[PDB]
Amino acid sequence: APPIMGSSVYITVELAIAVLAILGNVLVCWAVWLNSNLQNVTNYFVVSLAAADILVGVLAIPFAITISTGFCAACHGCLFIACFVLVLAQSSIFSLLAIAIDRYIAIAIPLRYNGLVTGTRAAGIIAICWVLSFAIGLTPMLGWNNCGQPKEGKAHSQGCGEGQVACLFEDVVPMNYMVYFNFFACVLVPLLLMLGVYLRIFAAARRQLADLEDNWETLNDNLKVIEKADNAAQVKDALTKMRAAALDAQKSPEMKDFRHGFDILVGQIDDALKLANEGKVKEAQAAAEQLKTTRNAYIQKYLERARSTLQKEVHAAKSAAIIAGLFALCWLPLHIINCFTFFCPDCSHAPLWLMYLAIVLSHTNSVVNPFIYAYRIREFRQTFRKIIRSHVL
Ligand SMILES: CC(C)CCC[C@@H](C)[C@H]1CC[C@H]2[C@@H]3CC=C4C[C@@H](O)CC[C@]4(C)[C@H]3CC[C@]12C
Ligand SMILES: CC(C)CCC[C@@H](C)[C@H]1CC[C@H]2[C@@H]3CC=C4C[C@@H](O)CC[C@]4(C)[C@H]3CC[C@]12C
Ligand SMILES: CC(C)CCC[C@@H](C)[C@H]1CC[C@H]2[C@@H]3CC=C4C[C@@H](O)CC[C@]4(C)[C@H]3CC[C@]12C
Ligand SMILES: CCCCC#Cc1nc(N)c2nc(-c3cccs3)n([C@@H]3OC[C@@H](O)[C@H]3O)c2n1
Ligand SMILES: CCCCCCCC/C=C\CCCCCCCC(=O)OC[C@H](O)CO
Ligand SMILES: CCCCCCCC/C=C\CCCCCCCC(=O)O
Ligand SMILES: CCCCCCCC/C=C\CCCCCCCC(=O)O
Ligand SMILES: CCCCCCCC/C=C\CCCCCCCC(=O)O
Ligand SMILES: CCCCCCCC/C=C\CCCCCCCC(=O)O
Numbered sequence: 507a508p509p510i511m512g513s514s515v516y517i518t519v520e521l522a523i524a525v526l527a528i529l530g531n532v533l534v535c536w537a538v539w540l541n542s543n544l545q546n547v548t549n550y551f552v553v554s555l556a557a558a559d560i561l562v563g564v565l566a567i568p569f570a571i572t573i574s575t576g577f578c579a580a581c582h583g584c585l586f587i588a589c590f591v592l593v594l595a596q597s598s599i600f601s602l603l604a605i606a607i608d609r610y611i612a613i614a615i616p617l618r619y620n621g622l623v624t625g626t627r628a629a630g631i632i633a634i635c636w637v638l639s640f641a642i643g644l645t646p647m648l649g650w651n652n653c654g655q656p657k658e659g660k661a662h663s664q665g666c667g668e669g670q671v672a673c674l675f676e677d678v679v680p681m682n683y684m685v686y687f688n689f690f691a692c693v694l695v696p697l698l699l700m701l702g703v704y705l706r707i708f709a710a711a712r713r714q715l716a717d718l719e720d721n722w723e724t725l726n727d728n729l730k731v732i733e734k735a736d737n738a739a740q741v742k743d744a745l746t747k748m749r750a751a752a753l754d755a756q757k758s759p760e761m762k763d764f765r766h767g768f769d770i771l772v773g774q775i776d777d778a779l780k781l782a783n784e785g786k787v788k789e790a791q792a793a794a795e796q797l798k799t800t801r802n803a804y805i806q807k808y809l810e811r812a813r814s815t816l817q818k819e820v821h822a823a824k825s826a827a828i829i830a831g832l833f834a835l836c837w838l839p840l841h842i843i844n845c846f847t848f849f850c851p852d853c854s855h856a857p858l859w860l861m862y863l864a865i866v867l868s869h870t871n872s873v874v875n876p877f878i879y880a881y882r883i884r885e886f887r888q889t890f891r892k893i894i895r896s897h898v899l
Contacts, residue, residue, distance in 0.1 A: 516862045517571050523869045524563035530876030531556035537889035544885055547628040548608050548822075551601040552879075554632045555829075558597045559872035566591040567869055574862075576674050578666035581653035584673035585646055592688060593643030595837065599696045600635035602830040604628075606703040609823050613710050613816075617757075642692055645683070652678050681848040689841045700830050707823045715816050722809050724751045725801070732778075732794045741790045742782035748797075749775045760811070767804025774800060825882040829875055836871035840864040 534556040538544045569587040612619050656671040664672050671677065728744040728751075735741050752772045756765075774797050781790040843856050843864055856864075879886035 512859070512862075513574065516574065516866070519866050520567050520571055520869065523866060523873060524567040527559050527563035527567070527869070527872035530873055531559040533890060533893060534876050534879060534886075535560075536893055537886060540893070541885065541889045544889060547623050547625055548605060548612075548826075550625065550628045550632065551604045551608070552875075554636070555598055555601045555875060558594045558601070559875060561594050562591065562869060562872040566594055570865060570869070573673050573675055576660075576664065576672045578661065578664055578670045579673040580669060581651070581656060581671045581678055582647060584671060585651050585653065585678050586644070587673070588675050588679050589644050589646055591643075593639045596639040596642045596692060597636055598833060599693060600639065601632075602833060603696050603700055603703075604631060604635070605826050606700045606707070606830065609819070609826055610703050610707050610710075613707055613714075613819050613823070642688075645687065646679050650680060650683050650687075652680055676847070681844060684841075684844045685848045689844065693837065693841065697830065697834055700827075704823060704827045704830075708820065711816055711820045711823070715813060718755075718809060718812055718816075721751045721755050722805075724748070725797075725805070729794060729797060729801075732791055735787070735791065738782045738785050738787040738790065741787060741794070742779060745775055745779045745782060745790075745794070749779070755808075763804065764808055764811075767800065767808065771797060771800045771805060821882070825878060828878055828882065832874055832878070833871055836874075837868050840868050 535553055538549050538553050569590055572587055573584070608623060611623055615622070653671070657677055660672045660674075660677070661670060666672060725748055728748045731744040732741050735744065749772060752768065752775060756768050756772070774793065777796075778790045778793040781793060843861070846853055847855055876890075880890050881887070
């Protein structure tokens with residue numbers, strides 16, 4: 507069948523993908539620019555991500571279309587249009603790796619997060635990572651290429667000029683770079699680091715929610731113990747434990763009542779302890795019952811406001827992990843095909859239709875991030891609606 511027929515489907519699909527990558531990711535950047543609530547360090551790596559996805563539809567996809575033709579070109583010039591998408595894919599990994607780290611710092615040390623993780627530093631890291639993306643993505647241009655052994659039978663068959671080659675990806679980029687350097691070192695290892703960072707985010711979250719439920723139990727159980735105690739020493743024991751678990755939880759209009767609610771609580775425990783150390787066992791049990799009023803007015807509201815925040819931090823970590831995981835679902839096929847081309851020379855090269863299919867799959871990854879934000883993030887969804895209603899409609 508004529509090559510232009512199959513090539514037309516691939517090109518139409520690529521262009522259709524390009525439009526969707528530019529539209530959806532320009533919509534993300536427009537939301538982060540307008541909504542002040544969306545302006546945080548975590549969302550500055552999202553804009554770096556969206557920028558990389560914008561450049562895929564504007565440059566990487568046009569470049570991919572160009573190299574599918576095998577047009578005659580200067581080898582190093584063809585080497586650039588073959589390696590530019592590696593820069594964009596490398597930038598996406600750095601951002602994906604920074605979001606995972608930023609979400610870990612947020613849940614592992616929320617108190618020193620505002621000073622440690624600032625916007626000006628996020629900008630310096632984004633700039634640093636973008637430069638390194640060009641260094642890593644264009645390494646073949648520094649010498650690790652196949653321009654020293656061009657297929658001159660292929661170049662002559664296509665009427666190429668002196669110093670030109672038939673611009674094909676696997677003919678100018680060595681496969682040991684794509685497998686050992688790009689896939690294993692620069693794509694796989696970083697994705698494994700993310701997997702481990704997300705394992706520690708969720709581990710730190712399950713632990714903290716449980717430890718807050720342990721204090722909530724240690725208080726009420728010690729209150730029940732006092733309501734059934736018999737002497738002043740028992741009461742003094744159940745209060746010594748409660749004071750430890752109270753100050754332990756202490757560690758805005760809401761933070762003012764949160765600090766007042768614990769002053770009352772810890773103070774009321776001091777009230778009962780003095781009586782327990784004075785031999786008054788009845789007056790101590792009565793003073794401890796006033797904690798039941800502080801509990802149903804301050805403590806139970808704090809426990810639930812802290813439980814909700816930990817849940818909101820887990821929801822966001824999951825949303826971030828769905829973005830890095832879908833990056834693997836889209837890029838692993840094309841990487842796994844390169845491994846078969848590289849590791850098994852006795853295997854038939856994957857057919858051209860599977861290459862196209864794997865190539866367009868890697869490009870659909872630049873369309874899906876705006877959908878995860880709109881689906882899994884309430885603030886992004888609302889801001890997308892505002893832009894669509896006010897400007898696009
Ligand atoms: C700011 C952005 C939009 C500029 C984009 C410039 C791009 C399209 C330019 C920059 C370098 C250019 C390449 C450099 C060298 C060659 C070798 C020549 O034998 C074939 C064209 C080719 C392969 C060029 C194609 C177009 C190219 C990739
Ligand atoms: C969710 C993702 C990671 C699963 C996708 C795995 C895909 C890319 C794997 C599964 C089976 C693989 C194929 C199995 C057999 C062959 C025949 C061989 O002569 C060329 C490679 C080729 C054609 C493989 C290419 C890659 C392949 C299609
Ligand atoms: C941990 C996961 C997500 C990373 C991906 C695993 C990759 C590296 C694995 C999965 C399947 C593997 C391939 C399975 C079969 C073959 C055929 C063999 O003759 C050469 C090695 C080769 C080509 C393997 C290379 C490595 C491979 C591509
Ligand atoms: C098969 C169609 C003919 C032209 C081609 C090709 C081709 N063959 C590959 N073996 C290949 N491997 C990659 C990868 C880059 C980063 C990770 S995997 N690419 C790039 O990904 C989209 C393609 O258009 C190209 O830009 C590849 N292209
Ligand atoms: C295709 C079914 C319709 C749904 C569309 C989505 C699925 C597209 C997936 C693969 C298309 C490529 C199929 C494989 C084409 C192989 C061509 C072939 O058999 O080789 C030519 C042979 O040399 C001469 O007979
Ligand atoms: C708006 C920013 C995006 C600009 C992209 C411009 C659209 C170009 C799309 C595909 C270009 C592919 C050209 C193929 C080159 C080979 C042609 C030939 O061999 O004669
Ligand atoms: C805004 C920054 C502008 C710089 C953009 C980079 C443009 C040049 C990119 C790659 C240079 C490769 C072209 C060299 C021709 C190939 C030489 C050869 O094969 O003999
Ligand atoms: C590091 C961030 C800025 C990088 C922007 C991209 C500029 C181009 C980078 C490398 C170009 C190397 C290829 C130069 C062509 C040389 C051709 C030859 O030697 O025959
Ligand atoms: C072959 C050299 C290319 C440079 C490597 C590119 C891939 C980056 C992989 C790991 C970088 C590690 C530093 C980034 C932060 C993650 C560290 C961590 O696990 O906490």
